[PDB]
Ligand binder design. Sequence first.
Ligand SMILES: [Ca+2]
Ligand SMILES: [Ca+2]
Ligand SMILES: [Ca+2]
Ligand SMILES: [Ca+2]
Lengths: 91, 90, 9
Amino acid sequence: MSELEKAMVALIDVFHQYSGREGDKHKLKKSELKELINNELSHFLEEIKEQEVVDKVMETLDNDGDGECDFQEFMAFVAMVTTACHEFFEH
Amino acid sequence: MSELEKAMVALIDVFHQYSGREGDKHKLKKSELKELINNELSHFLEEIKEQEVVDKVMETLDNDGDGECDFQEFMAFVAMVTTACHEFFE
Amino acid sequence: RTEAWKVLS
Ligand SMILES: [Ca+2]
Ligand SMILES: [Ca+2]
Ligand SMILES: [Ca+2]
Ligand SMILES: [Ca+2]
């Protein structure tokens, strides 16, 4: 396993670490996504403390109107953030 | 750093490792995307031996038409592959 | 394992 391969299995992992807490085990509800951002992206994103902040993110990630974030939506989220971090590395 | 945050840095890193080899140092030419798939995604993708595979893969990824894969284009690639693997846990 | 060219979106 390459580092790349390992990083991918890591993403599957943390998504599930959180998506299995409540409700549908394969989707993130607002509470789970909040908990994820706050515990696993603490260094990359401002902490979410306000409900209105939660809504905007989920509203950003949720494309199929169900109000949850599935894995495909989460990958879109991971790319947003990683694309952010990467810009911090063009010189 | 969380595992997730490290995982993100690893993706930036693997991209830097291959995109700086030849040509534009911030993008992947076909040879570099080929070397990257073959050396770092051997467990997820069939080894690429035919040029026509590389061409077709690049054609999918090159959404700005410049014949190469820049970083955001590379994230889209990583989301595809990862999304394929995840069906293992669908 | 899958062939890389089949990846779509
Ligand atoms: Ca859930
Ligand atoms: Ca959704
Ligand atoms: Ca290059
Ligand atoms: Ca391109």
